[PDB]
Every structure is written in C-alpha cells, then in structure tokens.
Design a protein around this ligand. Sequence first.
Ligand SMILES: Fc1ccc([C@@H]2CCNC[C@H]2COc2ccc3c(c2)OCO3)cc1
Ligand code: NA
Ligand code: NA
Length: 497
Amino acid sequence: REHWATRLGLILAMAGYAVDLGNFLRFPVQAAENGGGAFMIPYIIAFLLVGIPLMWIEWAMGRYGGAQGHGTTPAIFYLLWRNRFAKILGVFGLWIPLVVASYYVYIESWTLGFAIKFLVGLVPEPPTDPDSILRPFKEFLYSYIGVPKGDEPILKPSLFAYIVFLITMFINVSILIRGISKGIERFAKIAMPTLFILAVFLVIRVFLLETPNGTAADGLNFLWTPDFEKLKDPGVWIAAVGQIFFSLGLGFGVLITFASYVRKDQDIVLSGLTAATLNEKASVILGGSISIPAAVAFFGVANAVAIAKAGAFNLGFITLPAIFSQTAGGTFLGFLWFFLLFFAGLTSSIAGMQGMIAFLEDELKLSRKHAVLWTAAIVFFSAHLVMFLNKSLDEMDFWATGIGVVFFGLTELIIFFWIFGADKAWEEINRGGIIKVPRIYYYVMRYITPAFLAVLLVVWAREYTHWTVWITRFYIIGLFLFLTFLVFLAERRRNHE
Ligand SMILES: Fc1ccc([C@@H]2CCNC[C@H]2COc2ccc3c(c2)OCO3)cc1
Ligand code: NA
Ligand code: NA
C-alpha cells in the first residue's frame, strides 16, 4: 500500500484539498452577510466544537482503516461496526464525492478557460455606469456556459468550454495516475507554494487600488467592521457551523481516504491541526484581502452590501473580471486571479477523485491505471448532465452537500465514537501523536459535536418541483444503486478468495 513520503507533503496535500474557491470567494461573502468581524465569534466557536473534532475523527478512521488495507468507508464502517447496514451507509462516502465530481471538475475548467482567455486577451473591453461594465462580462460567462436564452432547460456550452473541460480532465488524470507520493504529494509541494505567491501578489496589488469611488481600505473596513446585533440571529450561528463544515471539507470521505495513506503510528493529531490551520489562515488573511476589498474599492462602499448579496459566484466570475478590464495591467491580473482559482480547485479535485480510485484499488483489486481511468470515465460521463441540463448542478449540489455531508458527518461520529467505542476511538486518535488531544475534547466529540450536527439536520428537515429535477434525481439515485452493486461485488470477491 502507498504512503505519504514526507510529513510536509501530507500536510500540504491535506491543505490542498481544504483550500479551494471557497477560501477566496465563499467565506468572505459569508462574513460580510453575517456580522462582518462579529461573524468570527460563531466561526471560531464552530471551528473548535465541530470542525476540529470531526477532522481528527476522520483522520483517525482513515489511518485505522488504512492499516488494514482499506481507504474507503464501505470497508472502514464495517470494521468499526460489523453490520450489513454499516456497509450500505458506507456507500454514501463513495457516493457524495462522486456526485460532487460531476460538477466540480467542470466549474474548475471554467477558471482554466477564463485564465487562458484573459492571458491571450479574448475578453470583453467595456465601455461609465456599473451595469455598462458588468453586463459585457455577464454575457461572456453566459456564452461560455451556454446559459439558456429560451424557456428550455438546456445548456449549450461553447466548443472552447467543452475542450478546456477535456483538458482539465486530462490534467487531473496525469497527476492521479502517478500515485499518492509521486503524484498527489509531489504536486502539493508545487501548487501550494505557487498558490501562496499568487495570493500574496494579488493581496499586495489590491491594497494599492485607488479609484474615485474608493480604496482597498474601504473594502477591508466594510468586511471586518463588526455587527454584533447579528449574533442574536440563529441563522448566523447556523451559517458559521455550515461554513466550517464546508471550509475543511468534512463529510466527503476525502479526509478518510487521504488519512489511510498515513502510516500506522505516524502522527495525525498535530498534522491535522496544522493543515486545518493553514486553510483558515488562507481564508481570513488571503481570501478576505482580495475579492471583497477589490470590489468595494472599485464600486464604492455604497454598493458593498449590494455586492455581498450578489453572491460569491457573481463576484468571482462576473464582478472582478469587469474590474480587471478597468484596471491598469488588468489583463495579466485576470490571468493570475483565474490561475489562482484553478490550482486551488485542482488540488481539491484530485483529492475528491482519490476516494473512487482507492475503492477500485483496495476492494476490487484494480491497478492504479485502471482505477484512475474508470473513475475518470464515470466522472466525465456524469458531467454531461451538469454541462447540458440546466439546474442539474443545483440538484446534485443540494443532496450531496446540503444534507449529505452533514448526515454522513453525523454518521461518522456515531459509528466511530459510539458504536465502535469512545474509549477505543480516543486511543486511536492520540496514538503516535506528537501532541496529545486536550482531554476536554473527549466530551466535545461525544456530545457537543454530534449535537451541533444533529441540530443542522433538524433545521434542514423543517426547512425542506419542475419535472427535470427528476432526471438528476434519477441518475444520482442510479449511481447509489451502481455503487451498492460494486460494494456487493467486493464482498463476494472476498468470500471466494
Ligand atoms: F458544494 C461544495 C461543498 C464543499 C466543497 C469543498 C470545500 C473545501 N474544499 C473541498 C471542496 C470539495 O472538493 C471536492 C470534493 C470532491 C470532488 C472534487 C472536489 O472533485 C471531484 O470530486 C466544494 C463544493
Ligand atoms: Na475551504
Ligand atoms: Na484544492
């Protein structure tokens, strides 16, 4: 079985997964809409009571399963809980990242395409007024995606967009086919430093932006000036718990897969805490210093609220590209921005596709080449639904991350810390640990963490159709059936040998 070569490589690979577009787009918009600097109060709380405890647990389950040659939850859940229902629940940890894969790598290709378009100058050049600058780029994105101009729910992606998606798929395979250390880990050691440099250069250049409408200081001001009156709102405390779950990539089964390549007695306590901390520093320092400040700098603090409400997606793919066409040397600026997002996405996507590669290797005994190619085949095939059927993406993302990760997140806790045994679980986490987990976390993991998660489930249920969503529901239901069949074939192949 493969292992991580260096402790640094392991941390950078784990961080590479956590850090993505959300760090530079989603988190800054979440903060502005939920109290500005005051949003850090429930965010740090959520980080301590939910994020950190669960990540350690997934790291432990990963290393525990990896010692016995299993990197995926269908096999690991069965080791923690000798039951048939444990194998079936495990299918979800194979299903969720695979559902995400169908739209994630595609959106990832958008950044690459946009980076190429910016570098070679194939971008709009307005013209005055805000809508006179934004609309030419609003149409640039819609022509790239193929946003329906009629009543039909049909997307018609450009040939360029489709080809870049092909190229993006290829790049992912290239890294994945070289394995864990010589592939994922090797790339982690290049991308993360490259990422940091790209970010810092943008942070510096954004801080020098000055327009008749405002400055970069106005951006950092609007974003971080606290509004504690919003702390009364339970929705803010829910968004904080949700964002942390989103930020670290919990409940995807990815961390478990990666942790399985950590050797039996190697540290996971300090290693996990370090990687988690990098992701957070990236969000508050790098992520919060670029997108929102640059936007507020150009349009003024008067439109700062309007900008935040327009969402993280509009900000990154419409607003900032418009601003770049109006700034000095913006054409190279746009390339760096989208190059930055691409590498951030590429280090997450190769991790999310590893779980399927691991299953095909560990349980069906396929070669790494075959495992990678068939995984790529499944993801590439599935993506045509996301590329051509409008709002299919929303439907996949809703089941997969809206409730799926949290439900699966709660499933991990109960299976590992309650069914497998809290005492056995606790010894598993701290074993080989450079530092020991604070004893107070024993109660947090066992009661506080699953309670917070269970609350998130209940609010989802109480809170929550055009016929085309049934197409997406049809297929993702089919995937779960197909993966169930593979798990079935796995346990049958094992009885023979
Ligand atoms: F809707 C969303 C929820 C959570 C997130 C996470 C946020 C932190 N960084 C990791 C993100 C998930 O990344 C993935 C996961 C599986 C994948 C993948 C990429 O490509 C193929 O299979 C992104 C989007
Ligand atoms: Na993140
Ligand atoms: Na990434």
